[PDB]
UniProtKB/Swiss-Prot annotation:
The gene is MB. This is Myoglobin. Keywords: Cytoplasm, Heme, Iron, Metal-binding, Muscle protein, Oxidoreductase, Oxygen transport, Phosphoprotein, Transport. It is found in: Cytoplasm, Sarcoplasm. Belongs to the globin family.
Length: 154
């Protein structure tokens, strides 16, 4: 699929606000995921034991994981669809080391969209959420295609 430059601009505009606090947004996103979809927590051998939202908030390991996720994702969006080199190593570790089903990527997408909506109401109106949703659906699509070539899912 293809995003127009205007949709890309919508996406990189909100993203620039995210980047004012990568660590905070990363915590919010992971916690939102793990609360909504507890089964995802189990994939994280280093976080698996955390029982409550308060423990999550206090974990320096979870905060570090969030920055990683967002830092990686940010590098992809900034490519505006020309993200083939970037997707390859991510698709390989997520399919063959971590074994992350596509379904779980949909879940974190929903969590990203939830947090932007709460923290940036002004820069995340309907048009901007439609564009981020498209950007994330592109990402998921391309990653699903890579999984299949690598021998996972599909
Ligand atoms: C926006 C989507 C995501 C991005 C950009 C992302 C990116 C990354 C990055 C850059 C790493 C470190 C290097 C590597 O192993 O590839 C990583 C590690 C990891 N990711 Fe993801 N990830 C995403 C989604 C997920 C989801 C949804 C899960 C599980 C439900 C997950 C589970 C893991 C695990 C288990 C590791 C290893 C953590 C540790 O033990 O160091 N990832 N991810």
């Amino acid at each position: 699929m293809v995003l127009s430059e205007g949709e890309w601009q919508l996406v990189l505009h909100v993203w620039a606000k995210v980047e004012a606090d990568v660590a905070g947004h990363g915590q919010d996103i992971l916690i939102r995921l793990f609360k909504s979809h507890p089964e995802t927590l189990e994939k994280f051998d280093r976080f698996k034991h955390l029982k409550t939202e308060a423990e999550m908030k206090a974990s320096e390991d979870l905060k570090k994981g969030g920055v990683t996720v967002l830092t990686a994702l940010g590098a992809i969006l900034k490519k505006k669809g020309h993200h083939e080199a970037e997707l390859k190593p991510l698709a390989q570790s997520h399919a063959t080391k971590h074994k992350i089903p596509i379904k779980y990527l949909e879940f974190i997408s929903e969590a990203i969209i939830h947090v932007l909506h709460s923290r940036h109401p002004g820069n995340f109106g309907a048009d901007a959420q439609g564009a981020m949703n498209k950007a994330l659906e592109l990402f998921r699509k391309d990653i699903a295609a890579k999984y299949k070539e690598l021998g996972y899912q599909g």
